[PDB]
Amino acid sequence: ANKPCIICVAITGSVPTKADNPAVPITVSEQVESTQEAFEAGAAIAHCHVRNDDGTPSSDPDRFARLTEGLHTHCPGMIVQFSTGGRSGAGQARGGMLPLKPDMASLSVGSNNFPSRVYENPPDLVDWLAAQMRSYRVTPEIEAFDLSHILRAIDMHGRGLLYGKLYVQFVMGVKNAMPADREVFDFYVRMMRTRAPQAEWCAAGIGANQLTVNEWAIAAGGHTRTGLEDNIRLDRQTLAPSNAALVRRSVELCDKYQRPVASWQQAREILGLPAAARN
Amino acid sequence: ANKPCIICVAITGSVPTKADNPAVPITVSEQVESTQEAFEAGAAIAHCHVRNDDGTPSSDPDRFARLTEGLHTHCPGMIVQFSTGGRSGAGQARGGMLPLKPDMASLSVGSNNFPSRVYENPPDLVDWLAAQMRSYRVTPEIEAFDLSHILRAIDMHGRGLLYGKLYVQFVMGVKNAMPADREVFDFYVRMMRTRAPQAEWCAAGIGANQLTVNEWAIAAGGHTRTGLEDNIRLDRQTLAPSNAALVRRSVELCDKYQRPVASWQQAREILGLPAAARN
Ligand SMILES: [Cl-]
Ligand SMILES: [Cl-]
Ligand SMILES: [Cl-]
Ligand SMILES: [Cl-]
Ligand SMILES: [Zn+2]
Ligand SMILES: [Zn+2]
Ligand SMILES: [Zn+2]
Ligand SMILES: [Zn+2]
């Protein structure tokens, strides 16, 4: 394509533990180190959650602040994207980190099932989170778990609800949500190209679908995500030894399709972000 | 097509009240009368909720039993479909009417947003409701509020989770869910035709989209739903005077597209139901 490809690394998430894979970074220091390697390997965006030291989920703003400072000092220029995840926190707590003014924050605009629960995003919460992102000038990345979420995001964006330039992530392979289905993927891409041609998109696959969805996205001209949050293995059994190892796989696919890996500067420009991180 | 078209009437729902439109049937007697007229007008399936006398939502099995007896005596042969709706009840209460052995029951297999809330269908509840429908030999009608729900239903059906023959309803126009979008509709139809060619489908539109979605479904060879549950008006302002009036609109569209209105006998055969109601 020669079009640069933005690789996002989803470093930790809310679910995986060191019992699942010893490579999962849990503490801030672990996260900074893991993220730096990933940055070096080609990731331009860090998609961040925080944890308690024991690995349990957290939404604590002070932990986000600590992580951010580490990323700003060790990964200068890298785009810092905070989760507002529903497995990491509940209600308005899910937006308590927003006043820190990250570059970006992931945002669900719909609800859907998850492996063991409803992933709840009530309309009032969606609207509140979106308003906070307008206030603090935080560009959302929309985490679209189903088709109507893509359409909703497009409508919202046109209506001014979503700060900045529209960036939609197709999340595929989550149990009880949307599987990694190639025909659906192509329809998703069609919706973006036809209904939101000025917007950007990416795609993320879970588990064994991570690498496959990377390939789909990269070959189709979009952007993509990888990392331990989404997948802890290299095949049916083999554990992935780092976030960076997963990034390198994505990089190889960029090479295969003759697309440069977007630098953090390119990624900022593509996504309509400030040229330098705030704060 | 000359293919018969099954018209379902959604008589009451959980939301509309007599304050919204005086034609909404609330009590069992009202419901039987309204349903009979609709039956006479061409509806083969009654999609039923029950209410307290004051119009508030209910899941009471005894009220379902009463309604069923009325429909069996006044609308003999008509297919009786019970709601397991999340606005009418919570948790396993949403399946408490199933032991009455209706012909069918509506079932959500995913979650999604609604006008003012998350429409919660946790995976454990979906699985429980499905198991109850297997036990009691109640054929589900899948209420698909988004694309992944259609795919999930197809997968479930192939795996034996869904009793009887697969029947999927595309529900379009619910605020914060999936809008009535023609391109999505055509994709939905493609999924059914290609992924589940032995299955049947229908489509239902909310509000001002009711008539439009009727036309889309009827012209495309599928089946459809109408009724006061889904829409209380005939245009921007004019109230619909009965469930039957809404059915007649659907019938006109069948005439337009040269499709006969399925008799209740045809509908039973198409949907793989017993030739006569149990009990
Ligand atoms: Cl879960
Ligand atoms: Cl490596
Ligand atoms: Cl609601
Ligand atoms: Cl009429
Ligand atoms: Zn995340
Ligand atoms: Zn800083
Ligand atoms: Zn209903
Ligand atoms: Zn009976």
- Contact in structure between B245 and B40 (CB atoms under 8 Å): no
In single-letter form, the type of residue at position B210 comes to Q
What letter represents residue B6's amino acid?
A: I
> What CA–CA distances, in Å, run from B189 to A278, B195, B203, B216, B223?
47, 10, 10, 10, 11
Closest chain B residue to the Cα of A186, Cα to Cα: B187
Breaks (C-N over 2.5 A) in chain B follow: none
CB atoms within 10 A of CB B135: 12
Query: How many angstroms separate the Cα of B119 from the Cα of each of A156, A192, B90, B109, B195?
Result: 20, 26, 11, 11, 26
DSSP structure class, residue A93: G
Chain centre to alpha carbon of residue A193 = 20
Token pair listed for A7: 């690789």
Tracing tokens 């109408």 back to the chain, one arrives at: B226
Closest CA to B188 of B168, B166, B212: B168
Amino acid at A176: N
Residue A178's CB is within 10 A of a number of other CB atoms, namely 27
Structure tokens at A244: 């960076």
Q: Which two tokens mark B45?
A: 């399936």
SS3 labels along B194-246:
HHCCCCEEEEEECCCHHHHHHHHHHHHCCEEEECCCCCCECCCCCECCCHHHH
Token reading at B88: 């009418």
Instruction: Report residue B174 as tokens.
Output: 């619910």
Please, which contacts does B193-200 make with residues 24 or more away whose CB atoms are closer than 8 Å?
B195/B151, B195/B154, B196/B154, B196/B157, B196/B166, B196/B168, B198/B165, B198/B166, B199/B154, B199/B157, B199/B165, B199/B166, B199/B167, B199/B168, B200/B165, B200/B166, B200/B167, B200/B168, B200/B270, B200/B271
Place of tokens 């509840």: B125
Region for residue B258 given its phi and psi (left: phi exceeds 0; alpha: psi -120 to 50; beta: otherwise): left
- Tell me, rounded to whole angstroms, the distance of Cα B84 from its chain centroid: 11
CA–CA distance, A60 with B250 (Å, rounded to integer): 55
The SS3 assignment for A22 reads coil
- Partner residues linked to B8 by β-bridges: B45, B225
B216 touching chain A per CB within 8 A:
no
A136 neighbors A104 (Cβ within 8 angstroms): no
Distance from CA of A4 to the nearest CA of B (A): 30
Please provide residue B82's backbone torsions phi and psi, each rounded to the nearest 5 degrees.
-90, 140
A193: exposed, middle or buried (C-beta count within 10 Å: 0-12, 13-18, 19+)?
Answer: middle
CA contacts within 13 A on the Cβ side of B50? 23
Residue numbers after which chain A is interrupted (C to N above 2.5 A) read: none
State the number of CA atoms in the 13 A half-sphere of B142 facing the CB.
32
Instruction: Provide the resolution (angstroms).
Output: 1.5
Q: What ligand has the least distance to the C-alpha of B38?
A: 4
Residues of A in Cβ contact (< 8 Å) with B121: 113, 118
Question: Nearest C-alpha of chain A: how many angstroms from B151?
Answer: 8
- What ligand is nearest to the CA atom of residue B73? 8
For this PDB entry, the determination method is: X-ray
Q: Which two tokens stand for residue A156?
A: 């919202």
Strand partners, A104: A81, A139
Give the number of other CB atoms < 10 A from CB of residue B249: 17
List phi, psi (to 5°) of A6.
-85, 120
Q: What SS3 state is found at A56?
A: coil
Closest CA to A10 of A111, A135, A104, A116: A104
Dump strand ranges (E) for chain A: 7-10, 45-48, 50-51, 57-58, 79-82, 104-107, 112-113, 118-119, 139-144, 167-172, 200-205, 223-226
Q: What's the CA angle centered on B222, arms B226 and B256, to 5 degrees?
A: 75
Residues A136/A274, Cβ–Cβ less than 8 Å: no
**Widest distance between CA atoms in chain B:** 46
Q: How far apart are CA A153 and CA A201, in angstroms?
A: 12
Residue type, B148: S
d(CA B157, CA A181): 18
Please enumerate in sequence order all residues whose Cβ is within 8 A of that of A54, keeping only pairs 6 or more positions apart, or say none: none
The answer to whether B82 faces chain A, any CB pair under 8 Å, is no
- The residues, ordered by sequence, that sit 6+ positions from A58 with a Cβ below 8 Å of its Cβ are A49, A50, A51, A52, A88, A89
DSSP A5: B
Handedness of CA A187, B175, A123, A87 (dihedral sign): negative
Beta-ladder partners of B171: B204
3-state secondary structure B184-196: HHHHHHHHHHHHC
The DSSP result for chain B, as a single string, is ----BPEEEE---SS--TTT-TT---SHHHHHHHHHHHHHHT--EEEE-EE-TTS-EE--HHHHHHHHHHHHHHSTTPEEEE---TTT--GGGGGTTGGG--SEEEE--S-EE-SSSEE---HHHHHHHHHHHHHTT-EEEEEESSHHHHHHHHHHHHTT-S-SS-EEEEEE--TTS----HHHHHHHHHHHHHH-TTSEEEEEE-TTHHHHHHHHHHHHT-EEEESTTT--BSSSSPBP--HHHHHHHHHHHHHHTT-PBPPHHHHHHHTT--SS---
* A171 contact residues in B (CB cutoff 8 A): none
Q: Residue A5: which region, alpha, beta or left (left: phi > 0; alpha: psi -120 to 50)?
A: beta
B274 inside 8 A of chain A by CB: no
Contact A127, A137 (CB under 8 A): no
Strand, helix or coil for residue A116: coil
Helix residue ranges per DSSP H, A42-181: 61-74, 123-135, 147-158
Write the CA distances from B143 to A48, B103, B106, B152, B190, integer angstroms. Answer: 35, 16, 6, 11, 17
- The single-letter code of the amino acid at B40 is E
Query: At how many degrees (to 10) do helices B209-220 and B182-195 cross?
Result: 40
Amino acid letter at B83? S
Distance CA A13, CA A50 (A): 8
Q: Tell me the three state secondary structure of residue A107.
A: strand
Nearest to B28 by CA among B55, B1, B4: B55
Q: Tell me the shortest Cα–Cα distance from B157 to chain A, in angstroms.
A: 14
CA angle B42, B10, B26 (to 5 degrees): 115
Parallel, antiparallel, or unpaired: how do β-strands B118-119 and B112-113 relate?
Answer: antiparallel
Domain boundaries, chain A: 1-279
What six digits make up the tokens of A89? 């926190």
Contact B58, B50 (CB under 8 A): yes
Q: Which residues contact A29 (CB under 8 A, 6 or more apart)?
A: A70
Contact B183, A151 (CB under 8 A): no
HSE on the CB side for A171, CA within 13 Å?
Answer: 27
Distance CA B129, CA B140 (A): 10
A158 contacts A124 by C-beta, under 8 angstroms: no
Token pair listed for A83: 């989760």
What's the CATH superfamily of B1-279? Aldolase class I (3.20.20.70)
Q: Do A148 and B178 touch (CB under 8 A)?
A: yes
Interface of B with A in 155-214 (CB under 8 A): 176-179, 181, 184, 187
* Whole-angstrom distance, CA of residue B165 vs CA of residue B152: 15
Q: Do A112 and B148 touch (CB under 8 A)?
A: yes
